[PDB]
Amino acid sequence: TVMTQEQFVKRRRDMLEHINLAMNESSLALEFVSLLLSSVKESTGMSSMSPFLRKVVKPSSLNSDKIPYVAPTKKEYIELDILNKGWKLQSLNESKDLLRASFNKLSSILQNEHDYWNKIMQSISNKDVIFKIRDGQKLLAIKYGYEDS
Amino acid sequence: RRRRLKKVEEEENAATLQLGQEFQLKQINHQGEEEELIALNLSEARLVIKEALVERRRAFKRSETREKELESIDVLLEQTTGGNNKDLKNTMQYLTNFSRFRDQETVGAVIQLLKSTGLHPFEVAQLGSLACDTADEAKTLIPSLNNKISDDELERILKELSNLETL
């Protein structure tokens, strides 16, 4: 396949926006758990706060109380189990597609490399001299000069 | 300044917090002021020395599992430190094997968790170094903890640190 500059920058921007949303959700989760921490401790939770949040709301402003211990029902057990089976199946299908695409890429690359090596053998005799060289990639350079002859 | 012999002093004992006149809590830095004595736990020492080595590598250029980390720090030592590195290499493999915490986030948050104790830097460095599992075990391993920390606070700190240690 072929991929372009505009496609590259589009993919970069969309993964950037997705990871922005990721850190936003994680940061609100952390900031919530530290806000609830500051009610009882006030020492360690204040470190992970935001200065704007401390400006707009004072700590120790949340509270929790214990509802009694409850045994979860079997209906949501089988709901979670069937959702687990669906998630596993979808992950397996995604893995299959990933492995097939990577195999196709690897097979094309290996065909090119094996053609290169067969050309090297049918091209280069042991009398010739070859050494690696950098640009910084590895290239095989043959010395055809007479300076050592 | 007085020229007294002052040859009488107590022996340097970690149990009695005596670490020598050159290891007091207040240390005079090169800029002049008194500053708190810096005691590093083993993970903290490994992170600090690794940061120093990568800083020296960057200066030279401009001028995670244990197996993949040992080779990386070894080639870093080879490309960074010259001769007489046998002691440094022994120290780096020692800090790799005895690494309670891997990344900087764990070590720094362990420091701010131990700063809530308000205890001596040496004993909290020992707590970050030694992997004690019970409060009385830490008390008999570190005699400075006797009549210094509450048993329940020590228990929750140790079991917290057990939760904090990774891999």
Partner: protein, 172 residues
């Protein structure tokens, strides 16, 4: 008066630590990739792997402390400004997640091939039981297939030179 005894002590600050590590690593990803030039691929792969390990540590900590966290409900306090900053608190205790994750979750639900709306619950129970038996058979097939296979000096230079300079024969 106000009290804070319904709050968990070690579960909550432990998950605060783990989530703080996750956020810090996400920030490291951000200032690693916000530049116009990407870093070389091994470092970013290591960052991705350590973030995945951090999140699996997060869910291990949370799932190991499953109960006594279902049992603690959160409510705000009068010290919280609930008039000029109730928009702050309504997206602070929310458990209704973003529409993308649960539309994908419902898409996952219908692609499982079996549902609840037209099947009775014990049929689902026996289907999950036989699926678990199939997992057991597959993993013991993998186990027996894995267990079927296995997983200089000819002389002394100094003595020769002592011969050539003195005449003493090399003693053997």
């Amino acid at each position: 008066s106000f009290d804070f005894n319904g709050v968990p002590g070690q579960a909550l600050d432990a998950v605060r630590m783990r989530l703080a590590q996750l956020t810090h690593s996400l920030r490291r990803i951000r200032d690693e990739m916000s530049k116009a030039e990407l870093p070389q691929w091994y470092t970013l792969q290591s960052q991705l792997n350590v973030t995945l390990s951090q999140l699996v540590s997060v869910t291990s900590t949370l799932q190991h402390f499953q109960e006594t966290l279902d049992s603690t409900v959160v409510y705000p306090l009068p010290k919280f400004p609930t008039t000029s900053h109730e928009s702050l608190v309504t997206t602070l205790l929310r458990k209704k997640n973003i529409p993308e994750v649960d539309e994908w979750m419902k898409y996952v639900r219908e692609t499982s091939g079996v549902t609840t709306a037209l099947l009775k619950d014990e049929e689902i129970e026996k289907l999950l039981q036989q699926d678990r038996e199939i997992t057991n058979w597959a993993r013991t097939t993998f186990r027996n297939e894995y267990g079927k296979h296995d997983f200089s000096k000819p002389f002394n230079v100094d003595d020769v030179l002592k011969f050539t300079f003195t005449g003493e024969k090399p003693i053997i």
